[PDB]
Amino acid sequence: GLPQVRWRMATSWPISLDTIYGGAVTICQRVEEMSGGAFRIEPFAAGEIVPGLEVLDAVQARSVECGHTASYYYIGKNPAFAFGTAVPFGLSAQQQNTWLYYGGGNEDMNALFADFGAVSFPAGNTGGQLGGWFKKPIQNLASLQGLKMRIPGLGGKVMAKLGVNVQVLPGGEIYLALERGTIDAAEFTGPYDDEKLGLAKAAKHYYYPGWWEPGPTLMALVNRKAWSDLPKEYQAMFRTACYEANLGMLSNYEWRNSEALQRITRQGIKLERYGDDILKAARSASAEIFQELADADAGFKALLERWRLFRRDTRRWNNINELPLAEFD
Amino acid sequence: GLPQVRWRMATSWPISLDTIYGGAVTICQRVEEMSGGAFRIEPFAAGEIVPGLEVLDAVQARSVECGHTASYYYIGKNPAFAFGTAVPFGLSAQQQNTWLYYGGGNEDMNALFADFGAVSFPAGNTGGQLGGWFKKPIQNLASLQGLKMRIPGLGGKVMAKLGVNVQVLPGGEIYLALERGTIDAAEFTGPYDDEKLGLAKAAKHYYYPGWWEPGPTLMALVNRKAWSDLPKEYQAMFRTACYEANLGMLSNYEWRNSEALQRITRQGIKLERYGDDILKAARSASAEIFQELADADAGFKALLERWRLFRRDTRRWNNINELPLAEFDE
Ligand SMILES: CCCC(=O)C(=O)O
Ligand SMILES: CCCC(=O)C(=O)O
Ligand SMILES: [Ca+2]
Numbered sequence A: 001g002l003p004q005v006r007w008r009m010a011t012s013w014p015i016s017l018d019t020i021y022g023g024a025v026t027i028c029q030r031v032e033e034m035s036g037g038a039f040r041i042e043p044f045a046a047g048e049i050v051p052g053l054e055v056l057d058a059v060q061a062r063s064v065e066c067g068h069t070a071s072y073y074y075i076g077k078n079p080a081f082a083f084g085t086a087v088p089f090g091l092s093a094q095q096q097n098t099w100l101y102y103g104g105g106n107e108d109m110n111a112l113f114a115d116f117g118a119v120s121f122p123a124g125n126t127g128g129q130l131g132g133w134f135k136k137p138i139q140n141l142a143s144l145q146g147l148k149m150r151i152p153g154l155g156g157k158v159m160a161k162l163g164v165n166v167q168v169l170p171g172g173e174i175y176l177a178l179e180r181g182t183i184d185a186a187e188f189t190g191p192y193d194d195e196k197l198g199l200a201k202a203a204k205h206y207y208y209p210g211w212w213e214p215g216p217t218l219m220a221l222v223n224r225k226a227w228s229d230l231p232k233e234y235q236a237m238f239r240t241a242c243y244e245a246n247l248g249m250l251s252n253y254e255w256r257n258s259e260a261l262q263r264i265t266r267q268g269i270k271l272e273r274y275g276d277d278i279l280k281a282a283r284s285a286s287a288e289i290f291q292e293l294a295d296a297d298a299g300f301k302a303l304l305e306r307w308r309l310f311r312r313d314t315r316r317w318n319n320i321n322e323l324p325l326a327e328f329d
Numbered sequence B: 001g002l003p004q005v006r007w008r009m010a011t012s013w014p015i016s017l018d019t020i021y022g023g024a025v026t027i028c029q030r031v032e033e034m035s036g037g038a039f040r041i042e043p044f045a046a047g048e049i050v051p052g053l054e055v056l057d058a059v060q061a062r063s064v065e066c067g068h069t070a071s072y073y074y075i076g077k078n079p080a081f082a083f084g085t086a087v088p089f090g091l092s093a094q095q096q097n098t099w100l101y102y103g104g105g106n107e108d109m110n111a112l113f114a115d116f117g118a119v120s121f122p123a124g125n126t127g128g129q130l131g132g133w134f135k136k137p138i139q140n141l142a143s144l145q146g147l148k149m150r151i152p153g154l155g156g157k158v159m160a161k162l163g164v165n166v167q168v169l170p171g172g173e174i175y176l177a178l179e180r181g182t183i184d185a186a187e188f189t190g191p192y193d194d195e196k197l198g199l200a201k202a203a204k205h206y207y208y209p210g211w212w213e214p215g216p217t218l219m220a221l222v223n224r225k226a227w228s229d230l231p232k233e234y235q236a237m238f239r240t241a242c243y244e245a246n247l248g249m250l251s252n253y254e255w256r257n258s259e260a261l262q263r264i265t266r267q268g269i270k271l272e273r274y275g276d277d278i279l280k281a282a283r284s285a286s287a288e289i290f291q292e293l294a295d296a297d298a299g300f301k302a303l304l305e306r307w308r309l310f311r312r313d314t315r316r317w318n319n320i321n322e323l324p325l326a327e328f329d330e
């Protein structure tokens, strides 16, 4: 007889986003199915029991046993957490999964989460993000000066160096903030989530690419001690379920964003590519931010150099095995 | 008490093909771990209990309960099985997973396997394959006329329409055949597997891309009646373990191929892009082959048109959300 385990999972997400909230639900449903009801986890939307941006805090305190969040929400505690979500001009979703599972990423991220009493598992990806929504159209790089924009992580810091006034909001809050006039622009994920949250209603000017988040990972987090007290069978169920959340969510976003792109263009939204004045300035600002973080911390520097090497090698591989068919019509 | 289930899994793979055999091992180990030993599956290498090309036949007959194979080994039984692995100029591994899980592909493939008493689950990908190994560099499309090349499946049929003299050889045999002068060229999967077979020693010209296999799926198969007999808990364990095999294998190949590519370029291998004359002729010959299959069968035609639509839409999406960052090299 294995125990009846009953857990709660705090998430960073609103229930309306069945893509990303769906990853948390998948983990909870699958351990219940595999355990025949002996191992249950109740998922909660952002703000129900824990604020969306404080999932790691609640997991560390053990006010919940586990969570579903984005590591880059905690760059204030350790800028190295950025690599476990996405960094500007960083890894594709497929490269990010390769880096986590076989390039040393999951070991690097678990070493950081160990400092906050937690263990981490990849448990979602949005795939490549788009460039966000603007109430007024962008004319050139100088159009960004003084804009109030919702955008998190090191992407936010890059946009701040370009003169954007970066605002902190969980996904659920963006539409009201855009309507009330609190902000002038926002990015979230892509067509499917952006349209569902009402971003295409609040703003008409959509850009690409989302160079800040080329393949952002969502992590399942478990309290170290809660994880220790789990029998080996239930650890295996949870760990395996997170692979389904990770591959299942990426595939779900690819499908839903592909349909939503067609829907919003038919409904009147025009998608524009960012000018090279913005892309060049973003790349340069990103290099400056990573240089500063590296000079301030040998651990960050060492991780940045291992990740940069992984990135160079995997891009060289994908330039041969994938890019030629992607660009040939 | 849930039952003590003991199954056997027939695989299409030698144990030396370890990244792919590893997918089968992952499923077997993970259901044993999650069930605390109550659900065990014993994996077998190709030939040990069932020939590698007869996994589906063995699963249908229930001589084994489950299998790990490539749907495109069964195109002689139904050419529609091709889409469940890879087709020339088809889907990237990421697009292939999107198509299977959400685009209707798993439902299409399960309707085909239902004819043979089987249910199917995605359970691996090699990722994009390369264009194979050539002793002498290719000058142009006419250089392929009469060239003796190891290349199997629909890829071989396309290369045949380009005038290639298609040679059938096992993985293990290609090195000797290249050295002996028996064949002029050969493809397998990519740098990791190809280096282990000695192909970097036998030839200096490695072509790309492998337009015949842009993201080949490996499928777990279960006998429909064996699956029916399985408690709901063990079904969930098996189905979930196949997601780990699928994402795990692709990521493992990406890592191994990226490392092996660096080793073989240091060993003086030249990476050559196929000329547009070959890529245009191959795309056209592939479209002719799929046209003939479609004209001979309304069910094939319908599936080809659903897949072509999914492919157009996903490519349109990836041209926006991925290609811009992928094509700028620093
Ligand atoms: C990582 C998914 C959520 C996100 O991209 C964001 O909060 O912007
Ligand atoms: C998917 C493995 C089979 C193959 O690609 C080959 O033998 O060439
Ligand atoms: Ca975002």
Ligand SMILES: [Ca+2]
Pocket (backbone or CB within 6 Å): B129, B187, B188, B189, B213
């Ligand atoms: Ca091959």
